[PDB]
Design a protein around this nucleic acid. Structure first.
Ligand SMILES: [Zn+2]
Lengths: 99, 68, 1362, 260, 67
RNA sequence: UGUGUGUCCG
């Protein structure tokens, strides 16, 4: 029974060594994945806060503008509308402000 | 005597088999983590692209408003 | 004969540019127009031969070459023209004076008798009543001037005809004044001694035209001077004289009724005001209207100063005083006024400020603004005023615009959710609106307090269209008998060629809406939508947009716009779509007074997140039109386009207006420096410009009102206050609810409420200014209980009387289609009814109406314009002269029997009558009983039935078949149909008006009346929802005599001319009246004999008529008892038992209705002496499937099917009767609509068609002040004798009777507490439940209708299902 | 024999068991480090909602802003170049800032176009509105004098001189508003305008214990005929509250007063 | 003697092996739960960023043809 | 010869 016991012990040792090797390989893969911290988490986390600050600043600044009405908005809108449907400049003569 | 030795050897082999199947199940479920990898790569671009868009927006705001 | 018919009333702006031509023909000098082209142009063929007329040369033989403006002389003519001259008119208007007075007296007596018969009468009457009335009528100041001016008006109206060659002139010499007339031109010769002088020695009129040295040399040794004007000034003066006479007569008569205190100002103060205004005008020229315009604000401030007088209540009067002083000092610096004239010119506003009157008297005085005339308008000044505010540069704040747009979208969404079930299925990537998602999933809506941070979230909401573009339910909007502009090709063809100096190369064909609507080959609603969507209004020939000066006003000039035909159609379609699409989310009405509402309801409504005190302030929106720019209104227009299926429809105006050339289409002054060379590209000058950025008044009014409501709602959200808004005319009133705790007394509540109102006003001013529209803080005022809005005036809940606006407009002559007597009398009657609706005095208005009725009758009999001179209507139509007795008898029988009577005393109690026939019969019986001529009732009511069809029966279900009660509508409709027969190449109207339209109409009308029993109201209701109704409403578009006598399409149909037919029908109608005992039969009197009941006799009269229609079938649902005959009053003493309820009420008793008086006073102004001055506490079936956004045709078919199903409930033919009517309207078949028809289950369908459907709203004809001090108990009737009693009319009758009974006695002097109205047992019946039964079917082919409009439409179930 | 062999085989197995334990603890600490580094992934899961809120708000605001402005937004450089020559504003709208445009307006060097100047003044003048001073009038000496004159009958009466001296005292004392307010209140409560003027001359604290003004007069021609009944000799120590409105001094040392 | 000691040593080794296996199973369960917590929510944030990127791209495309 | 001198949106 000595030979069969020796064979069984050797097989068990080989199996446990294979288990150790595969566990080490999985550990190495996990370490490689964690080397960069999965990569984008930190800089996208900072970018989210930066974007939030920029958008809030723009929204706050939007409440301090003053607009001056021009004398060619209607003509430009009419020209754009006439170009959108059956694209062609409107028939002559020219409109009030052709620019 | 020998009966106890062989019985404990069989128990050792059974527990070793259980450990091996547990380890291979652990490896199979660890390699199933790549799902969490889908919302890592592509999403990054979106955020970056969004950043770029916002950036150019600010630039355009400085080309129209008279400001100081 | 002729194609001209001048009007009798002023309805046009006063322009005197053409007069410069006349003065050049006669050789005089005058400068009325600012256009130098008129100085050296070519005179027309007429007004050039004035140098060949002997009469004109003789008239202008001893006058200087210099003339004076007519606007400096109108007060002088008004003061110095009495009736003492020799007029060419043969029968003078003063000859038939005494008769009128007699008639007036008689009418007054009748009224008294009527009241004494009802039970109202008066307490402690005075025997000397008729003598005072006679003295007041005879002692009027303007009695003879009115007749003289009417003679002048008749002369000038007759003379304006004869458009051909060889025209004649008329002459009048009235003592000092000389008047000459030649074809719409008047020369006045006046002494120079009556003109006020300057410090330089010249009259004030000559300052602006001549220097001091030139005028003195020109005059030298002359005593008379000549002025030239048009014929509109004479009409204006005649209207002024009539208004002054009416006002003075009413004021004088009202003093007799209540000597101690009346509601009218006075009869001597008003004369002083007239004199002061006349002097101010005679000194200051046409610029005195800038001061006359301040009468209304001063009266408003004086009424404002009749309250507790908080610290800021006197700000408005101070501001008005400062403004009037500044204007007075500004407009007189250049003029060299003498110190005496300088002191005497301010008396107008000096008197106005120093008045001390009750608020009612001030409110009555408020309505005499237009009693001084109207200014002379110029094109250049109006163009300069319009050019500013329209080309100015504005500054805007984007954040306010964003918030307003969000509020707009929120309001639309809230209105959609309130009806229609639940949310509108928002599309477009829901995660973009985090916060609204919870509400959408839970299917709820934000209340209001929490919608302040998610306001931006409404920007991202998207939906399919919510409304449909095929809901035009009326085709008369596209044909309305108006005028439009001409094409850009021939824009300058509307001016006179002689003044222009060159003949236009291109000429237009027509200029009227009806003369172009019938010749549009491819007219259709979808065609109009396609035309708008393709931006086809940008074509080079569709940009004219002419201007036109407005009618009588007091400003320097206001202008409206005119568009070519297709753009006008687009504008009309847009307005129609916005009326019943959007703008229902923004209600503008309400008119809620916190002093006349329930306490708990007011508290619940005023709660945002305890007594409630509300304030208010009013703002003016008339200048808002020119302050709208594209940069502000673009998002709203885009959203309006998206809510429908259209693309570029709602922004036609902002796209096509700046590309136009702005000018005023005035016939006698084209734009400056116009020449044949620069015709295609004309220059701009003092009367023209190119760049227009603002809006135009009238166009797109609904959208602008919606934007204003959105702004108000935004302000309401911004500040935590509850706001209600109302918009009417040119004003909007905004009220703010403040809500207060219980322990805050009543002293600081008003102060806090006014503080809150001022806060709201400041916030609204800031917001609107940020939007680009500027409020003026110096005119907006804040009050805490006084509200004036359109036709309503309230002071702390008390309604103020204002009846001089309508009572002073009564006139014998008015435009009523060929001077029809019936039209004039009907207009006078309606004016009298409207006037008596207000105030608390009855006699003055009736006296004025009676005075004017006889005068109109006489002036039409002797001076009809439709015939030649010397023609007498009252002689040849009878063979003998018409006497007073015949006229008096023919003015007493009512119009429903054909009798030219419209002043029904019954109208003094309530407006809408249940049955006109019974009321007319009772009035005739009472009038015949008052005099001792009782034996004429049967011959008067017998008459002879005429010939009529079923169409005439279904037009007026409550009428009779007598030819004398008909109008001119049938004649005009026949003329229009005849014109359509040989015209109207529209290719879509022609389909509707096919060969057999009349036969189909006859068949449908006959079938609708073939039921058993026959009901006429149901037939009339059903008839309007068929193609017959559409044809009928299209046919009736004629409105004036000018378009009848001048239309090209109407007058080119050959045949007999229209004038001869009009003369013949007028002669026939005049023969119908005033004849008597010539059109009556002796077969009906026996049947009507021995009835002694108004209801039975009226039923017999109705059944005898329409005999050829109703063979023997009974007629129901058309007769109702008169309210006076039903009830009798007893006027119970506070401590007294009713004789009716105790002495003769032993066996069963008699039902009655009770009236009791409250004791709480609440508020009173100025005192509680009068009942009218005080108010009291006390307030005055679902379908299985409902379609979304249904079309007009689908809806009409739905109610038609519902009505047919409901009326025929006991029969089994409902499945087959409905189908032929729906085959021509909707594509769906029967058993598909039925699940959409709401379920109805009731009885006594006559009551459903009487009050539940409410063809009339009933309402009262008295002020609502008294109704709050009375309580009416009706449950005492018990079994209600379900009957013929109309409860609303009963309440109105009780309230009106109590009001009239005590209208002069003091509150303490009232000796009666409770009133019992006991019902008689003669005119009260019991109505059973009856259902109509039809024994046949229409079996008519209506499948030929497969066209657009209100006609059969495909795929009606396109909007989905709910 | 076999027992010893089993001994060393089990010793080797135990050693490999210790390396198994080492591998287990190594992977456990790697998992712990991964969890520590991954814990800041669920924290952006919350601030991303705020990022979405602010981004959507800005998107809506600027989308609506660009919607209202056409194809001629006229960038700032173009507007500045256009202002220099033919200084009329350029075609098409333009965008500024409130502080920047105010600063350019307050400096008389840039030559801002007149139309833009008046437009901005109109926009800005309405920001100074509060609970009060909304409809509050402005009152000067002449305006108050005319208002008082309009309420009196006749001309040349001593009440006119009283009004003139009252308005002069209010002007040089700067108290016109309170006088006008209380005069209006008195006129409202019901009394006669002359009684009102008595209330002004008796109630105003400034008018208390005041000496009437001395006016040089030429002769009886200058004085209006309506006041000849009011001439009285001057007693010592005149007082406004006693009934003094003015003092008239002649050339030859003659002093007279008026009695109301 | 020797056999009993060897049996005890093997039993202790197997007890340690099953203990570390249970620890690994617990760690697997905790990381599976953490991944599940970051499965659907992360998809939600991904689609939200997709929508925001789309709308911002539309805005900048609109702004581009203005300068 | 002076195209209907004008008389619109609610
Ligand atoms: Zn009784």
């Amino acid at each position: 029974h000595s030979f069969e016991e020796v064979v069984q012990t050797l097989a068990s040792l080989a199996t446990v060594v294979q288990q150790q090797t595969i566990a080490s390989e999985s550990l190495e893969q996990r370490i490689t994945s964690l080397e960069n911290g999965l990569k984008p988490v930190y800089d996208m986390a900072k970018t989210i806060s930066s974007l939030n600050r920029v958008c809030a600043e723009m929204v706050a600044k939007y409440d301090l503008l003053v607009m001056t009405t021009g004398r060619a908005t209607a003509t430009a809108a009419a020209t754009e509308a006439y170009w959108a449907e059956h694209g062609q400049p409107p028939p002559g003569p020219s409109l009030y402000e052709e620019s | 005597s020998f009966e106890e030795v062989v019985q404990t050897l069989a128990s050792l082999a059974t527990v070793v088999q259980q450990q091996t199947i547990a380890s291979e199940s652990l490896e199979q479920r660890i390699t199933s983590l790549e799902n969490g990898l889908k919302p890592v790569y592509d999403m990054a671009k979106t955020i970056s692209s969004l950043n770029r868009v916002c950036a150019e927006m600010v630039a355009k705001y400085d080309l129209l408003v008279m400001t100081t | 004969q002729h194609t001209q018919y001048p009007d009798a009333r002023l309805s046009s702006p006063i322009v005197l540019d053409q007069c410069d031509l006349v003065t050049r023909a006669c050789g005089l000098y005058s400068s009325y127009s600012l256009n130098p082209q008129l100085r050296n142009c070519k005179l027309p063929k007429h007004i050039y031969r004035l140098k060949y007329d002997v009469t004109v040369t003789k008239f202008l033989s001893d006058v200087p070459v210099a003339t004076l403006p007519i606007d400096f002389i109108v007060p002088i003519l008004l003061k110095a023209l009495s009736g003492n001259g020799f007029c060419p008119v043969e029968p003078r208007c003063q000859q038939f004076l005494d008769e009128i007075i007699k008639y007036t007296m008689q009418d007054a007596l009748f009224l008294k008798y009527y009241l004494k018969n009802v039970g109202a009468q008066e307490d402690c009457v005075d025997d000397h009543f008729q003598e005072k009335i006679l003295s007041s009528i005879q002692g009027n100041e303007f009695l003879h001037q009115m007749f003289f001016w009417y003679d002048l008006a008749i002369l000038t109206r007759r003379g304006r005809l004869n458009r051909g060659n060889s025209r004649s002139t008329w002459f009048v010499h009235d003592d000092l004044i000389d008047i000459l007339g030649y074809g719409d031109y008047v020369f006045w010769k006046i002494p120079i001694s009556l003109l006020p002088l300057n410090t330089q020695g010249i009259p004030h009129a000559a300052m602006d035209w001549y220097q001091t040295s030139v005028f003195k040399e020109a005059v030298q040794g002359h005593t008379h001077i000549v002025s030239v004007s048009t014929a509109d000034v004479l009409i204006m003066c005649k209207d002024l004289i009539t208004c002054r006479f009416n006002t003075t007569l009413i004021s004088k008569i009202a003093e007799v009724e209540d000597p101690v205190c009346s509601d009218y100002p006075n009869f001597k103060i008003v004369s002083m005001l007239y004199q002061s205004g006349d002097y101010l005008l005679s000194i200051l020229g046409s610029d005195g209207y800038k001061i006359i315009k301040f009468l209304e604000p001063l009266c408003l401030a004086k009424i404002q100063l009749c309250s507790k007088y908080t610290e800021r209540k006197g700000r408005f009067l101070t501001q008005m005083h400062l403004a009037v002083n500044h204007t007075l000092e500004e407009i007189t610096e250049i003029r060299a006024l003498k110190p005496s004239q300088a002191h005497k010119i301010r008396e107008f506003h000096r008197t106005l400020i120093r008045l001390e009157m009750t608020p009612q008297q001030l409110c009555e005085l408020f309505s005499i603004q237009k009693h001084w005339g109207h200014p002379v308008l110029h094109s250049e000044t109006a163009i300069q005023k319009v050019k500013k505010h329209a080309t100015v540069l504005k500054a805007l704040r984007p954040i306010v615009i964003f918030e307003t747009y969000c509020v707009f979208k929120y309001s639309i969404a809230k209105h959609y959710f309130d009806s229609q079930g639940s949310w509108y299925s928002v599309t477009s990537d829901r995660n973009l609106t985090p916060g609204l998602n919870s509400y959408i999933k839970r299917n709820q809506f934000p209340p209001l307090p929490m919608i302040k941070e998610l306001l931006w979230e409404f920007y991202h909401l998207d939906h399919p269209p919510l409304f449909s573009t095929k809901i035009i339910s009326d085709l008369s909007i596209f044909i309305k008998d108006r005028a439009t502009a001409v094409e850009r090709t021939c824009w300058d063809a509307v001016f006179e060629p002689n003044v222009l100096g060159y003949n236009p190369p291109h000429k237009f064909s027509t200029k009227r809406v009806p003369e172009q609507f019938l010749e549009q080959e491819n007219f259709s609603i979808e065609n109009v939508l396609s035309y708008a969507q393709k931006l086809e209004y940008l074509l080079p020939q569709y940009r004219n947009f002419s201007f036109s000066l407005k009618e009588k006003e007091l400003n320097v000039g206001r202008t409206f716009g005119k568009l070519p035909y297709p753009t006008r159609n687009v504008q009309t379609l847009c307005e129609a779509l916005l009326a019943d699409g959007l703008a229902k989310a923004f209600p503008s009405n309400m008119m809620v007074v916190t002093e006349r509402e329930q306490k708990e309801s007011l508290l619940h409504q005023a709660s945002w997140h305890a007594t409630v005190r509300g304030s208010s302030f009013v703002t003016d929106l008339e200048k808002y039109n020119l302050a709208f720019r594209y940069e502000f209104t673009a998002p709203f227009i885009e959203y309006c386009n998206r809510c429908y299926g259209v693309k570029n429809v709602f922004n036609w105006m902002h796209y096509t207006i700046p590309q136009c050339y702005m000018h005023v289409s005035d016939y006698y002054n084209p734009p400056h420096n116009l020449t044949l060379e620069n015709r295609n590209n004309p220059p701009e000058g003092p009367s023209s410009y190119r760049g227009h950025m603002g809006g135009i008044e009238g166009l797109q009014q609904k959208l602008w009102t919606s934007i204003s409501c959105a702004q108000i709602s935004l302000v309401e959200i911004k500040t935590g206050f509850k706001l209600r808004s109302a918009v009417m005319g040119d004003n909007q009133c905004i009220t703010v609810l403040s809500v207060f705790p219980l322990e805050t007394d009543a002293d600081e509540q008003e102060q806090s409420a006014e503080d809150n109102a001022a806060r709201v006003a400041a916030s609204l001013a800031k917001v609107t200014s940020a939007c680009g529209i500027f409020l003026k803080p110096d005119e907006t005022f804040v009050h805490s209980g006084f509200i004036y809005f359109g036709k309503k005036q309230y002071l702390n809940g008390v309604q103020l009387p204002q009846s001089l606006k309508t009572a002073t407009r009564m006139a014998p002559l008015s435009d009523a289609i060929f001077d029809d007597l019936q039209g004039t009398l009907a207009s006078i009657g309606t004016a009298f009814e409207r006037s008596i609706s207000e105030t608390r005095h009855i006699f003055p208005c009736r006296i004025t109406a009676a005075f004017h009725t006889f005068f109109s009758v006489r002036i039409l009999q002797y001076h009809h314009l439709g015939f030649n001179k010397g023609f007498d209507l009252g002689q040849l139509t009878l063979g003998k002269p018409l006497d007073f007795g015949t006229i008096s008898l023919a003015l007493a029988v009512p119009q429903v029997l054909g009798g030219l009577s419209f002043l029904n005393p019954e109208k003094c109690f309530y407006r809408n009558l249940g049955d006109p026939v019974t009321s007319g019969l009772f009035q005739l019986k009472t009038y015949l009983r008052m005099i001792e001529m009782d034996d004429l009732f049967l011959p008067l009511i017998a008459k002879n039935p005429g010939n009529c069809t079923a169409i005439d029966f279904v037009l007026n279900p409550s009428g009779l078949n007598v030819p004398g009660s008909q109008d001119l509508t049938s004649f005009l409709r026949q003329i229009v149909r005849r014109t359509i027969t040989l015209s109207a190449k529209n290719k879509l109207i022609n389909t509707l008006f096919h060969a057999s339209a009349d036969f189909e109409d006859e068949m449908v009308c006959k079938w609708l009346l073939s039921s058993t029993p026959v009901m006429s109201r149901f037939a009339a209701d059903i008839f309007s929802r068929t193609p017959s109704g559409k044809r009928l409403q299209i046919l009736g578009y004629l409105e004036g005599t000018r378009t009848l006598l001048a239309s090209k399409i109407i007058n080119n149909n050959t045949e007999t001319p229209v004038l001869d037919r009009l003369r013949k029908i007028t002669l026939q109608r005049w023969s119908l009246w005033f004849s008597y005992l010539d059109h009556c039969d002796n077969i009906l009197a026996e049947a009507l004999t021995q009835i002694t009941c108004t209801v039975d006799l009226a039923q017999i009269l109705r059944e005898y008529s329409w005999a050829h229609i109703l063979e023997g079938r009974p007629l129901i649902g058309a007769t109702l008892p008169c309210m006076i005959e039903q009830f009798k009053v007893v006027w119970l003493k506070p401590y007294e038992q009713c004789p009716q309820c105790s002495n003769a009420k032993q066996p069963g008793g008699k039902p009655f209705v009770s009236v009791a008086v409250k004791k709480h006073i609440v508020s009173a102004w100025p005192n509680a002496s009068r009942i009218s001055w005080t108010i009291g506490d006390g307030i005055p079936g679902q379908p299985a499937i409902k379609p979304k956004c249904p079309s007009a045709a689908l809806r009409e078919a739905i109610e038609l099917a519902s009505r047919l199903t409901w009326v025929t409930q006991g029969s089994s033919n409902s499945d087959l009767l409905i189908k032929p009517f729906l085959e021509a309207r909707v594509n769906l078949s029967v058993q598909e609509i039925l699940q959409m028809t709401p379920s109805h289950y009731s009885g006594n369908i006559v009551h459903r068609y009487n009050d539940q459907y409410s063809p009339h709203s009933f309402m009262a004809n008295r002020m609502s002040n008294s109704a709050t001090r009375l309580i009416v108990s009706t449950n005492t009737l018990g079994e209600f004798s379900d009957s013929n009693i109309i409860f609303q009319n009963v309440i109105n009758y009780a309230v009106a009777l109590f009001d009239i009974k005590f209208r002069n006695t003091e509150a303490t002097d009232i000796q009666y507490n409770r009133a019992h109205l006991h019902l008689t047992k003669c005119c009260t019946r019991e109505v059973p439940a009856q259902y109509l039964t039809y024994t046949s079917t229409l079996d008519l082919d209506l499948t030929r209708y497969r066209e657009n409009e209100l006609i059969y439409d495909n795929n009606p179930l396109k909007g989905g299902l709910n | 024999h076999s027992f010893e062999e089993v001994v060393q085989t089990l010793a080797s197995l135990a050693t490999v068991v210790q390396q198994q334990t080492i591998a287990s603890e190594s992977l456990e600490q790697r998992i712990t480090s991964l969890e520590n580094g991954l814990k800041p992934v669920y924290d952006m899961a919350k601030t991303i909602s705020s990022l979405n809120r602010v981004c959507a708000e800005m998107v809506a605001k600027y989308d609506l802003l660009v919607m209202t402005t056409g194809r001629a937004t006229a960038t700032a450089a173009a507007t500045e170049a256009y202002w220099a020559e033919h200084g009329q504003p350029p075609p098409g709208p333009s965008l500024y800032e409130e502080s920047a445009i105010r600063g350019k307006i307050e400096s008389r060097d840039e030559t801002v176009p007149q139309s833009v100047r008046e437009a901005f003044n109109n926009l800005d003048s309405t920001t100074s509105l509060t609970e009060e001073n909304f409809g509050k009038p402005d009152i000067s000496a002449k305006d108050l004098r005319n208002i008082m004159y309009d309420h009196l009958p006749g001309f040349g009466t001593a009440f006119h001189q009283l009004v003139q001296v009252i308005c002069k005292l209010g002007k040089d004392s700067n108290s016109l508003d309170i006088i006008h307010a209380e005069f209006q209140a008195s006129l409202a409560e019901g009394d006669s305008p002359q009684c009102a003027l008595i209330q002004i001359t008796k109630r105003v604290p400034i008018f208390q214990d005041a000496a009437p003004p001395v006016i040089h007069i030429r002769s009886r021609g200058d004085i209006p005929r309506a006041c000849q009944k009011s001439l009285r000799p001057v007693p010592p120590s005149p007082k406004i509250d006693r009934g003094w409105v003015c003092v008239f001094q002649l050339q030859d040392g003659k002093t007279l007063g008026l009695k109301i």
